[PDB]
Ligand binder design. Structure first.
Ligand SMILES: Nc1nc2c(ncn2[C@@H]2O[C@@H]3COP(=O)(O)O[C@H]4[C@@H](O)[C@H](n5cnc6c(N)ncnc65)O[C@@H]4COP(=O)(O)O[C@H]3[C@H]2O)c(=O)[nH]1
Lengths: 176, 176
């Protein structure tokens, strides 16, 4: 249902545009301005709980700097700019990884819609619409020319205690 | 169908955030840095044809400057910035108006989706999904606290010759 269009909007208006120029932006940040690994990691909490300050979700996740901004004219707005944050991940008090990680804001938009009444989005459908957003985005990236070893999806569901740093590092470790 | 979620995403992730701080940004541009009128005009072509360079849609529409950028932390991206362009509108070779006008990029996203095959969006449904995006966005703004005399929707359908400058000025004139 609604998650479909949100996934496609997420790809057509963002991933399709930044992923091609991401590895250049990363190569520039390592030099010009550990190293920052060459992939954008997208946090997909099925909870749809998308904090704005990441370190408050897990203190072991600590913001370090921003990438060199990428700009472009998009729909009559001169120099619309896409920014991306670089984060360090801690494990027992030491830097265990560094990557460009960020939440999927459509999930934050699925949350909000589930509370506006006129949106006709019953709030019990949150978890499924979240699941279809992941499943849909996943199939778009399977056939995406822009995604040629350039972004990794981190879906997860907090059941007690949970560590999102460990969650990320795991995906980060499995690539080496 | 899909236009619904695109309208809500357009409001929850954008209008709801910039409209509150728009009149401050405009008052600042008139002074600090005709005058720029205090409203964001959103071009909704039912054609869904959303050029990126506006002046190429109508040369009488000429870009002048940008507003003072507005920033905020959104979903783990530090200092995600919202920019908006200020345009001058000509009528027989003279400045007849000045406003913050921009296309609705969801319409550009409806176009693109109508050509990706796996998006399951038949391209004959473009005009209707465009019509439901306007009708839906219109009802969201009727009850929007953030929209208290702060943005005006410019829906239109090119049938021959057409002038989008004249189209805009008309809405601009009717407010005086
Ligand atoms: N982190 C990030 N994500 C972005 C950026 N641009 C797009 N995205 C992602 O793609 C979605 C759809 O983008 P869109 O350009 O097709 O429609 C956008 C666009 O029409 C409008 N919008 C948001 N930020 C804007 C901006 N800075 N300038 C102009 N329009 C903007 O609101 C819609 C929904 O935004 P959203 O943040 O909830 O979801 C984004 C967002 O998840 C971006 O610059 N940064």
């Amino acid at each position: 249902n609604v998650a479909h269009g949100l996934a496609w909007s997420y790809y057509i208006g963002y991933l399709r545009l930044i992923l091609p120029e991401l590895q250049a932006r990363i190569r520039t940040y390592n030099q010009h301005y550990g190293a920052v690994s060459q992939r954008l990691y997208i946090l997909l909490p099925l909870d749809c709980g998308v904090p704005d300050n990441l370190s408050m979700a897990d203190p072991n996740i600590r913001f370090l700097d921003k990438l060199p901004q990428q700009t472009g004219d998009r729909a009559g707005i001169k120099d619309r700019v896409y920014s991306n944050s670089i984060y360090e991940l801690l494990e027992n008090g030491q830097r265990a990884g560094t990557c460009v990680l960020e939440y999927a804001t459509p999930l934050q938009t699925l949350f909000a819609m589930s509370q506006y009444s006129q949106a006709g989005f019953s709030r019990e459908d949150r978890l499924e619409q979240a699941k279809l957003f992941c499943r849909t985005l996943e199939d778009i990236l399977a056939d995406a020319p822009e995604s040629q070893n350039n972004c990794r999806l981190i879906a997860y569901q907090e059941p007690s205690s949970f560590s999102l740093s460990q969650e990320v590092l795991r995906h980060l470790r499995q690539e080496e």
